[PDB]
Design a protein around this ligand. Structure first.
Ligand SMILES: NC(=O)c1ccc[n+]([C@@H]2O[C@H](COP(=O)([O-])OP(=O)(O)OC[C@H]3O[C@@H](n4cnc5c(N)ncnc54)[C@H](O)[C@@H]3O)[C@@H](O)[C@H]2O)c1
Ligand SMILES: NC(=O)c1ccc[n+]([C@@H]2O[C@H](COP(=O)([O-])OP(=O)(O)OC[C@H]3O[C@@H](n4cnc5c(N)ncnc54)[C@H](O)[C@@H]3O)[C@@H](O)[C@H]2O)c1
Ligand SMILES: NC(=O)c1ccc[n+]([C@@H]2O[C@H](COP(=O)([O-])OP(=O)(O)OC[C@H]3O[C@@H](n4cnc5c(N)ncnc54)[C@H](O)[C@@H]3O)[C@@H](O)[C@H]2O)c1
Ligand SMILES: NC(=O)c1ccc[n+]([C@@H]2O[C@H](COP(=O)([O-])OP(=O)(O)OC[C@H]3O[C@@H](n4cnc5c(N)ncnc54)[C@H](O)[C@@H]3O)[C@@H](O)[C@H]2O)c1
Ligand SMILES: [K+]
Ligand SMILES: [K+]
Ligand SMILES: [Zn+2]
Ligand SMILES: [Zn+2]
Ligand SMILES: [Zn+2]
Ligand SMILES: [Zn+2]
Ligand SMILES: [Zn+2]
Ligand SMILES: [Zn+2]
Ligand SMILES: [Zn+2]
Ligand SMILES: [Zn+2]
Lengths: 346, 346, 345, 346
């Protein structure tokens, strides 16, 4: 089969031909219908050799949707042809966190050699992919695969981040979304669907601010030195109940600390190495909590899919072939994909 | 009446004679039965002239218990002689936070000129004190006033901090308490009363570690460079579900970050100017939230009092006269009060 | 001033002339801009003499909005002219429930002689009204008073009921609303604003089903013997995550028990004497909780007002003068007010 | 092997000899170390032929602990010899409830033919037993199996019931426990470990009231016509925050409704056919919720085991051999087991 792989440190990923895998016991083989590109893949490919630990070659793609092609020995609960989304952050399944479906916060996975697809195990940017266990598949019915693939991370991650503090976001609350890309543009729509928060979007790029308004942001503010004052102006001096920072640069985290309300929340979701919130007296308001959330839970993925099926998430995508995979990653690096890049194998 | 006041910047507080106040409409005059000394009073007295904003002179004492002496015009809900604790963090009473009793997180108080007793308004270290409103008194019944006075901050503040994350502290959880002084020694006992968490206490002083074990800590370990490794040894490498840092120095916050579990919590309660947690990817575990909580809520103070009345809180105190007030503050500076210093007026 | 009062047991309320009150210390006098009619007023007026305990005469109206006219001695936090809504379920202000703003669940109010406006103390169906304390006023800014008055109960009560189980109502959930009247039509809109629940409305009247669809219900079905099967058909046999019964008759509670999901909720909000859910093994699904909620909290009223100010609540009203007050109550009895009746002085 | 089976409708269970089973793929064979008797087994054996639906013969025992004897094909996560408790309420593992570990509330199990051990599938009252999947085992380490077996239902069920409303049970709260038998005597101890509630126990039998005090009840009241007034006397007229009714007869549910506080809770846990709470205006206080909970969740079972391992649960048992199984069930019927009956195979 055709796949897109990261094959040597510092180089662009390449289109390859590798064997179509066969499922062992408990496993499922999917025919991939859509594979999302996430900016996390760029963080991974930019790691120096000393930091990089996922093995070479590596089939990319941690956002995967497909149809069941072959059942491994013992597998029931899915039929051949079933449309499924892949739950990404694989855990041990047995610990206290995993028993609640919170496999994103499993502490045993590393020691057991469990790695996620596209980030240690073979990903979804290929004609076919293996899934380790039935509990890591979620049915999607007749959902369009292209709009469905991003739900598995661009949807799941903001959904989880928002869910951690959803009781704060009552009528009268304000939520700030910093970064209107793959994650951010879905985050705005989740906020609108599950809360009565007023949503203020923040981005460097005017066209992303337009995207923000298109998907339901109440206001849009230019990022940078003026953002904090502009946000406070909109919130009448009380600040924002919650800030969801999908950039996570030091400048955006600083903006978040300068606008968050007393007894509010900052969720540092975007990854920028070295950047951090400074949580201490006189540097942040009383009662304003800060966290770096990771991925999401099994039941949260089901909820994201339910939002999509109810028509609550308009996922903005651009489609690419497998051959266009390396080019699509260049587009993501330069910031020219309006929403989520998705590879459709054929 | 006799009172202890901070009268000039940089100097020790002094015993003074000032008029016994009379309550205006809505106010209550208390005969003070006990007034706690909090290390926050030392932070206040160590502020340079440029930072200090509470006015001079200032009657100290933000931990107050008394008996109702005189009702101001229009006051109902209390009779002369009723034993009451003073709710410290006065708010506007009208905003969304105050409507839930969360006057500790009121955003309107500053602009309305509302200041707390002992920290802008006259405190409890005097024979008598004014309380602005009936809603800032809580009945204590026959509770010993000396052990009751610390409940209003040494009790309330750890109670609130713990309450923010109480659902995390189920059976199998571990809570670390850093700093076994006024706040910390009460915090250990709250954890034992309201959760099934295993409690690990941390302090510089071996006698405070003994205090920790006396009030129910399951383990007590020496603070400093070795503390993080010793705590991890006790938690089997998973780390601590929650860390309540009642010191809040950079070294203790660093210890907290090095031991906190995935999806855990650090509560930075102690105040050490410039110290802060660094909340960013690779600097803290995924899902570990951090906050600087402040004081507590009206209903939380009632719950603290209920714990005391049920025999769940053994409050360690040393008693001082009003004349010994300045000496008691020197004792607090040097770290020689085993628990909470309390002034009893006579 | 002119007021509408219940004056003798069994009779219709009457328009009267009574003195304009003056505020004592701590009190506020409002010029009333809008006063809602609630079907609870009909329950009260239909009480026999033995049951009725609110005193005669009684100025009706537990849904009140006004402008501050006079401050009593010592009152701060409001200026003359401020537009305010009245928080209805007055409590002692001092107990553990009241300290959290949950004065709707205060246990001390009765013994202290605290009664709510329109239900023991003088209500809002008058040119002016007294409010006991500043904490029982909530600012409404430039909100239209006519659409604002129902927020104080038609809004507050469903808001509280929904709020008790809001964490159940995630994406993929279903909420059933039984009774699309004053309360129900606002409840549909609250569900849409604060949850991703799919909303199924139930009513006897086809025009109320149309109202339900107008304010955002995803489906609207006829009440009665066929309702339970029709709801199950819509939910694919799993049933409804939550049922908010704003009728509360035995037949509607039975429908609720026949459709509620495992680990779901029934909120019995409407009042029908003797009617009750039967909560026991084999009579209801495992984990399905049932409650009769009452009114709402201080912070909940603020949230309802915030929803109204954000344009999330389209409150359907019909306006009446004080003189038309008795006629408006006849209209409410016969079921001919499409939404909430409101009296404007 | 030797087993205790229900073999014909209306008759006592009998000791039998049946083949030692072999595990299919995904299954685990346990050597049973302890098997609890639950009063639910008596409800089942008292069902008329028309109602009874679990098949004949049926190996009894839905409270099971053992050691792993043989792994079925593909099973990982356990070694031969590991001491484990059996999670009883088996679900499909795939639905939204099961994804959160809430297999007790799975809606798909019936249609998929999934039945629990001792209640449709073969139970633990035998030398060996099959478990369907690894996710239905929980490690117990060196816990005494005899005291561990009741944790799987006598522990789990009260734990879940209490957990549903744990945020109500703050300092100052009161919890009533009706019925101090297998479940009730563990329920008292859970309340003491995870809350600061004052605990009032209610039973018909004075010796069970003594048991209640032995395991930490603050007060003990005789059940019957006087119970409601005696409970109100103890709660000062406000009533009980929560009532956990482990009898569930109409008389005990009536007592519960007559004592529950405004904004409180009644949990109807015990099963008595036809008995029900009457939830309507003027028949129950405002805001007092009522529910019939069922069993518990995967993570809750882990928490119960963690309580046992921390020394928080003193489980009162009487031990029986397999041959004494039928006699033990007669003892349970007549109410002469002081706590939980447990069968130890040899
Ligand atoms: N925590 C997790 O579990 C998790 C999961 C997935 C992705 N991520 C991270 O989320 C981040 C975003 O990923 P994506 O796929 O949405 O990226 P993207 O490239 O699709 O979107 C980036 C967006 O951020 C905007 N942006 C960049 N700098 C900005 C600034 N200073 N101020 C305001 N806006 C700015 C861009 O204009 C663009 O709109 C990445 O760092 C990614 O690694 C985290
Ligand atoms: N956040 C709030 O609302 C709030 C409220 C009250 C007090 N506080 C703050 O809490 C802190 C504690 O106040 P207190 O009155 O309990 O003080 P205290 O002097 O009574 O107790 C201090 C304790 O901390 C220990 N300690 C000091 N340095 C340490 C270190 N590096 N490692 C371990 N232990 C150490 C001491 O040995 C002593 O036992 C103060 O900074 C105070 O201002 C905060
Ligand atoms: N719990 C509380 O705190 C509280 C507060 C306020 C009002 N209430 C009660 O809520 C109930 C509704 O109040 P309202 O002011 O909205 O009444 P309303 O007269 O405005 O509306 C009643 C609606 O119910 C519908 N209806 C009547 N019987 C029905 C049935 N069997 N099935 C389906 N629909 C039916 C009508 O067609 C109408 O649309 C009343 O019983 C009132 O006393 C309770
Ligand atoms: N909801 C569930 O998931 C679930 C799970 C397990 C058991 N159960 C049920 O819980 C109940 C208790 O089970 P168990 O095994 O502890 O029973 P058990 O026979 O060990 O204990 C019964 C206890 O209740 C007491 N009692 C009986 N009638 C009483 C009354 N009127 N007032 C006060 N006390 C009374 C007895 O004196 C005894 O102490 C049974 O009905 C059982 O079927 C329910
Ligand atoms: K919404
Ligand atoms: K405890
Ligand atoms: Zn990603
Ligand atoms: Zn795990
Ligand atoms: Zn202090
Ligand atoms: Zn305030
Ligand atoms: Zn009403
Ligand atoms: Zn009250
Ligand atoms: Zn059982
Ligand atoms: Zn299931």
């Amino acid at each position: 089969m055709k796949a897109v792989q990261y094959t040597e440190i510092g180089s662009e990923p390449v289109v390859v031909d590798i064997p179509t895998p066969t499922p062992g016991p408990g496993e499922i083989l999917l025919k991939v219908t859509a594979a999302g590109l996430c900016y996390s893949d760029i963080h991974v490919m930019d790691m120096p050799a000393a930091q990089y630990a996922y093995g070479l070659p590596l089939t990319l793609g941690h956002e995967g949707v497909g149809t069941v092609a072959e059942l491994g020995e013992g597998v029931t609960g899915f039929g051949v042809g079933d449309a499924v989304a892949v739950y990404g952050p694989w855990g041990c399944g047995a610990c206290h966190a995993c028993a609640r479906g919170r496999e994103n916060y499993c502490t045993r996975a590393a020691d057991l050699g469990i790695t996620p697809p596209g980030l240690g195990s073979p990903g979804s940017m290929a004609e076919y992919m293996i899934v380790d266990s039935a509990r890591h598949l979620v049915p999607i019915g007749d959902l369009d695969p292209v709009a469905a693939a991003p739900l598995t991370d661009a949807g799941l991650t903001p959904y989880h981040a928002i869910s951690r503090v959803l009781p704060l976001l009552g009528p009268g609350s304000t939520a700030v979304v910093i970064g209107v890309g793959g994650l951010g543009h879905v985050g705005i729509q989740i906020l609108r669907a599950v809360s009565a928060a007023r949503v203020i979007a923040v981005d460097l790029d005017d066209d992303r601010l337009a995207l923000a308004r298109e998907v339901g942001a109440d206001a849009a503010v230019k990022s940078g030195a003026g953002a904090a004052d502009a946000i406070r102006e909109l919130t009448g001096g009380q600040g924002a109940t919650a800030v969801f920072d999908f950039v996570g640069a030091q400048s955006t985290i600083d903006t978040a600390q300068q606008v968050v309300a007393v007894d509010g929340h900052i969720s540092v979701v975007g990854i920028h190495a070295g950047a951090h919130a400074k949580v201490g007296f006189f540097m942040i308001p009383f009662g304003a909590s800060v966290v770096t959330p990771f991925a999401g839970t099994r039941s949260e993925l089901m909820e994201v899919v339910a939002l999509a099926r109810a028509g609550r998430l308009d996922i903005h995508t651009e489609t690419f072939t497998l051959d266009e995979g390396p080019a699509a990653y260049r587009r993501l690096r330069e910031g020219s994909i309006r929403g989520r890049g998705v590879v459709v194998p054929t």
